[PDB]
Amino acid sequence: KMPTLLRVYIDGPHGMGKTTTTQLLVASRDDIVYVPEPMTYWRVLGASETIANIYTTQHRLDQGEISAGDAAVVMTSAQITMGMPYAVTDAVLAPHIGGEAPPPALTLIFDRHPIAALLCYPAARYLMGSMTPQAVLAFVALIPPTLPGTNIVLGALPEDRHIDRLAKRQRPGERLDLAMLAAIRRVYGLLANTVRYLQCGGSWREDWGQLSGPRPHIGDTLFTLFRAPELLAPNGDLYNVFAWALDVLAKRLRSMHVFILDYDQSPAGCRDALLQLTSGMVQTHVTTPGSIPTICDLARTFAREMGE
Amino acid sequence: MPTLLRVYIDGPHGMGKTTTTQLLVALGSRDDIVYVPEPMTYWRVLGASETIANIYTTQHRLDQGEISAGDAAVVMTSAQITMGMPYAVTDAVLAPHIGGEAPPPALTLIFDRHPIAALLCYPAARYLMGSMTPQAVLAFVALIPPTLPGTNIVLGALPEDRHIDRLAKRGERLDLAMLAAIRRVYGLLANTVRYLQCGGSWREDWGQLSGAGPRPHIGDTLFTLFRAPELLAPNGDLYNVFAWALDVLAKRLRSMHVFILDYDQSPAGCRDALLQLTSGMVQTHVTTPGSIPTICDLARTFAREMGE
Numbered sequence: 197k198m199p200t201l202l203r204v205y206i207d208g209p210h211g212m213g214k215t216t217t218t219q220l221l222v223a224s225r226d227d228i229v230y231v232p233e234p235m236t237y238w239r240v241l242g243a244s245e246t247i248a249n250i251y252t253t254q255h256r257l258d259q260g261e262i263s264a265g266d267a268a269v270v271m272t273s274a275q276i277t278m279g280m281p282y283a284v285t286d287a288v289l290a291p292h293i294g295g296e297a298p299p300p301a302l303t304l305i306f307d308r309h310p311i312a313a314l315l316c317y318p319a320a321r322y323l324m325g326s327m328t329p330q331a332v333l334a335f336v337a338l339i340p341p342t343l344p345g346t347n348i349v350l351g352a353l354p355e356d357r358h359i360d361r362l363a364k365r366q367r368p369g370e371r372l373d374l375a376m377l378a379a380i381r382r383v384y385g386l387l388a389n390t391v392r393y394l395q396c397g398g399s400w401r402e403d404w405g406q407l408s409g410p411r412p413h414i415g416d417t418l419f420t421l422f423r424a425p426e427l428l429a430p431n432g433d434l435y436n437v438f439a440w441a442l443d444v445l446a447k448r449l450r451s452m453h454v455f456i457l458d459y460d461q462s463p464a465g466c467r468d469a470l471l472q473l474t475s476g477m478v479q480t481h482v483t484t485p486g487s488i489p490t491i492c493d494l495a496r497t498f499a500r501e502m503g504e
Numbered sequence: 505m506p507t508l509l510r511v512y513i514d515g516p517h518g519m520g521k522t523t524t525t526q527l528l529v530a531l532g533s534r535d536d537i538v539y540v541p542e543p544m545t546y547w548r549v550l551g552a553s554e555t556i557a558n559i560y561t562t563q564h565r566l567d568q569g570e571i572s573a574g575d576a577a578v579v580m581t582s583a584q585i586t587m588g589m590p591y592a593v594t595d596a597v598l599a600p601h602i603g604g605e606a607p608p609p610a611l612t613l614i615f616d617r618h619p620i621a622a623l624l625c626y627p628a629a630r631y632l633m634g635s636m637t638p639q640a641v642l643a644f645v646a647l648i649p650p651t652l653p654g655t656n657i658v659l660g661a662l663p664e665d666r667h668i669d670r671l672a673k674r675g676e677r678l679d680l681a682m683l684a685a686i687r688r689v690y691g692l693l694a695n696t697v698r699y700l701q702c703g704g705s706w707r708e709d710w711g712q713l714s715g716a717g718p719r720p721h722i723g724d725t726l727f728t729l730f731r732a733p734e735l736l737a738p739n740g741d742l743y744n745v746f747a748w749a750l751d752v753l754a755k756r757l758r759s760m761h762v763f764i765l766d767y768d769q770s771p772a773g774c775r776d777a778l779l780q781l782t783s784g785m786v787q788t789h790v791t792t793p794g795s796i797p798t799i800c801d802l803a804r805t806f807a808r809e810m811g812e
């Protein structure tokens with residue numbers, strides 16, 4: 197039987213302390229790798245200062261200097277750039293991932309999952325009037341299939357403490373935007389409810405009627421974001437093309453494993469929290485003997501080339 | 505074990521893919537072969553407004569120099585994301601129904617285009633047109649869904665003079681430059697599958713770049729497009745992130761079953777030519793037994809909602 201792998205995706209909204217936490221966890225250097233955020237790709241390789249381009253566009257939209265449509269085309273392109281290292285990495289990793297599986301051979305810790313750039317952030321900008329809901333569902337359509345052992349760590353942090361940390365940890369080109377903070381915090385909260393809804397037997401088509409008046413309520417999941425008028429026939433029915441994208445979203449999220457990390461503590465308190473959380477995460481076998489070292493290389497090389 | 509035949513008619517626009525497809529479906533029955541048309545309705549209305557018209561106008565402005573390459577690029581990328589959405593969800597909802605490769609087929613699905621048209625060929629062609637970055641092309645490439653077994657793709661031959669003629673006959677604008685680009689791109693794609701089925705290996709042949717049947721030279725595959733200065737490290741090699749996107753391209757293309765159809769004939773000519781060619785096409789099984797009418801509903805639903 198092949199070596200076992202543990203994949204761990206540290207996600208949730210920005211500004212809770214997810215970079216310093218795992219930086220602290222980025223400290224044996226051989227049997228566990230930390231794939232950092234592809235900052236260099238964001239600022240240089242894919243495009244010039246993408247983050248700056250994102251926050252400026254939202255701002256200019258806010259000031260009424262540009263229109264909702266202009267802001268959408270810019271936002272949509274940028275989200276393509278933002279997402280690409282997360283997309284390639286997944287594509288090359290996938291063949292190495294086997295079935296589910298006692299300490300593991302290799303632990304991979306990623307800064308974020310593809311659904312950050314393919315679902316969560318697009319959905320947030322939609323709530324911010326800077327992306328059409330059709331684009332969001334286009335990104336959703338391209339969400340890679342959910343491999344086994346997809347453990348996503350999401351954050352818990354009270355809004356005020358979050359604003360504090362966010363203010364002290366602003367990436368280059370970023371503007372402190374409390375409406376975006378609430379957009380993203382709400383998207384990620386809805387995302388956690390969405391996984392519980394799907395796992396408890398939730399069927400979106402069954403409860404879709406309830407958006408008009410032992411699991412969450414559909415109005416508390418991400419499905420509620422797509423009762424958008426753009427997506428709807430004259431008689432209020434969802435177009436089938438959009439409904440199929442919801443079927444996909446449902447399929448992808450139902451099989452991810454969600455773990456909540458309380459960030460409301462000290463940097464190494466978060467670290468220990470992350471280690472405690474691992475005992476419940478799902479390991480997978482790899483698919484070939486030389487999968488472990490191949491994975492290790494991809495990881496170290498991603499780090500070196502696109503890490504901050 | 506019921507079986508299925510999926511055939512995707514692709515290639516540059518203005519050849520007769522659509523007519524030929526319809527003639528072909530018109531020979532089966534209202535129960536054993538189904539047309540999946542181009543989602544023209546999605547394109548003009550549902551996903552956005554007059555996307556085809558926005559694409560061709562944007563290119564015209566870039567040419568005319570009324571807009572920068574960058575402004576054209578964000579419009580083209582956004583438009584392309586929209587263009588490809590209905591292909592992406594269709595693939596995603598079909599995938600679980602498709603089994604291993606495998607007499608007559610229970611169902612035949614004739615598609616008007618494959619996902620890679622919107623996720624690769626038109627992006628690459630817009631890149632050659634100077635209205636998309638190579639980075640974004642690779643972003644679309646990295647999002648190409650895993651290639652299902654039994655992926656039969658029918659590209660088209662047609663002399664360029666005859667092709668120009670057909671086009672000049674007919675939301676678009678007569679762009680002969682674009683036609684060269686898209687013809688060249690689909691030419692490379694055909695070569696690229698051939699190059700890959702012949703055990704070709706782009707990493708080992710990369711240094712050879714500057715400027716059925718036998719294995720093509722890499723300079724005559726899609727790989728040639730991505731020796732662009734934006735993609736090259738100080739050392740003159742590709743950045744790994746781009747190399748990995750190219751690995752994905754090879755993995756997606758190598759398993760495809762490519763056929764060429766000659767469009768230098770009459771409509772019924774093409775139909776009978778395409779009908780002959782199907783004889784040598786790979787069928788697959790299906791997973792559930794009730795997969796077949798499920799798949800049938802989905803195609804008629806798609807056609808009814810997004811065709812004309």
Ligand SMILES: C#Cc1cn([C@@H]2O[C@H](CO)[C@@H](O)[C@@H]2C)c(=O)[nH]c1=O
Binds near residue numbers: 233
């Ligand atoms: C993933 C991701 C994304 C990150 N970001 C930004 O990148 C930085 C990552 O912390 C922040 O400025 C902000 C969260 C996006 O704007 N879009 C994304 O899709």
Ligand SMILES: C#Cc1cn([C@@H]2O[C@H](CO)[C@@H](O)[C@@H]2C)c(=O)[nH]c1=O
Binds near residue numbers: 584587588622623
């Ligand atoms: C699929 C598809 C795509 C079609 N098109 C266009 O659709 C138009 C059909 O009228 C043609 O100009 C061309 C086929 C794109 O420009 N990009 C695509 O990705």
